[PDB]
């Protein structure tokens, strides 16, 4: 399937992340 | 399938990320 | 299939990213 | 700006919604 | 700015919703 | 600007929705 | 600008939707 | 500008939709 | 299939990216 | 098939990118 020997990963949020939005308002 | 020996990954958000939007408003 | 020896990856958002939009408004 | 008199809104998820993904795996 | 007189809103999840994912696995 | 008298809206996910992806794998 | 008297809207996903992709793999 | 009396809209995805792609692979 | 020895990848958004849009409005 | 020894890739958005559009409006 999926195989990796050696790795380094980074994820970062500094803003807005939304899954499901109804009717709202998002700024920046 | 999918194979890798050595890697480095970065992901970053500094703005707005939305999955599913109904009727709302997004600024920047 | 898919094979790599050595790599570096970057992904960045500084604006608006939307999956599915109904009826709404996006500015920048 | 933005103006509405009368409305009805629905949003629904039955699958996978992701904002920011690094290195992972998504099935269906 | 933003104005509405009369409204009805619904949001529902029956699956997977994630903000920020590093290295994990999501099924359905 | 933006103006509406009367409306009905629906948004639905039954699959995969991703904002920002680095290096990962998506099936269906 | 933008004006509507009466309307009905539907949006649906049954597959894969991606905003920004780096290096990854999408099947269906 | 943009004006409508009466309308019905549908949008549907059954496959792969990508915004911005770097280096990756898409099947179907 | 797909094979690479050595590589560097960058992806960046500074504007609007949308997957599926119904009826909405996008500015910049 | 597809083979590379050494490479550098960049992708950038500074405007509007849309996958599938029904009935909406895009400015810039």
Author numbering:
A (entry chain I), B (entry chain G), C (entry chain E), D (entry chain H), E (entry chain J), F (entry chain F), ...: 1 to 28
Give verbatim lines from the article:
De novo atomic model building was possible for the ordered core between G9-A42(Δ19–24). The N-terminal domain is fixed in its position by a hydrogen bond between Y10 and G37. However, they all share the same C-terminal U-shape formed by residues K28-A42, which folds around a hydrophobic cluster of residues A30, I32, M35, V40, and A42. All polymorphs are different from the ex vivo AβUpp(1–42)Δ19–24 structures and different from any other published Aβ fibril structure.
The Uppsala APP mutation (Δ690–695 in APP, Δ19–24 in Aβ) is the first known multi-codon deletion causing autosomal dominant AD.
